[PDB]
Amino acid sequence: SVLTQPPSVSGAPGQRVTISCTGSSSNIGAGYDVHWYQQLPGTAPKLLIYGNSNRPSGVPDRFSGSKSGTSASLAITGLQAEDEADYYCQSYDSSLSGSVFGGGTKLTVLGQPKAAPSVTLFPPSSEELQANKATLVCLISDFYPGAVTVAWKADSSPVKAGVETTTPSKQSNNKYAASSYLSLTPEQWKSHRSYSCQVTHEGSTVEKTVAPT
């Protein structure tokens, strides 16, 4: 809205990373103090620094807050193993008659190497045919990272309806697994000759097909 933030910022583990926050002349440039918060994906945000002059208890001294007139800046020294969150600007807005937050910056560069994926295609069982639906599942497991595109074909034309893709989650041995469903009906399931799922990972494309008859 009234506060704009960059989408992402790049840095190195050992140099200085500085973020710039720009607003208006009635919320931050009027004279109001600014507050910075960290939005960890899964935990409630906490207070980092208020007023850019005092240090709250439990907060390290590596975080520095300054207000260069209409713009506020935050600087850090060294990238540790907990900076994988979002930084926001909080200031009182007279026009909005309340507190308004910023956009949010993501702090990550690269932590995902490559691996070799493996897929499995399982046709629906006999009890699924009488439910007036056909859920075609093509599971993908043991791959890294979790960025796989899913394409469905019926050996004559690609299927662009009912295609879904779930987000992958970390396995026990630091890998990723995913599944893809396809909503169909048993009326046309038997008419088609075969069904398959096609995926591509870093140029490696594998294909598995099943025959209902």
Binding site: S26, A30, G31, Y32, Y92, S94, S95, S97
Partner: protein, 50 residues
């Protein structure tokens, strides 16, 4: 001290203006500031709008 008949040019006539107008525009622009007073609700005295 003796002037004969004829035409004679003595000085020059200059019409000095008495008033000056220097107004360049007809009106100047404005900025949105009436919303400070024309508002649905106001703030309090411990935390007022700046």
């Amino acid at each position: 001290f003796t002037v004969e008949k004829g035409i004679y040019q003595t000085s020059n006539f200059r019409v000095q203006p008495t008033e000056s107008i220097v107004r360049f525009p007809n009106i100047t622009n404005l900025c949105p500031f009436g919303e400070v007073f024309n508002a649905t609700r106001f703030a309090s005295v411990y935390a007022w709008n700046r």
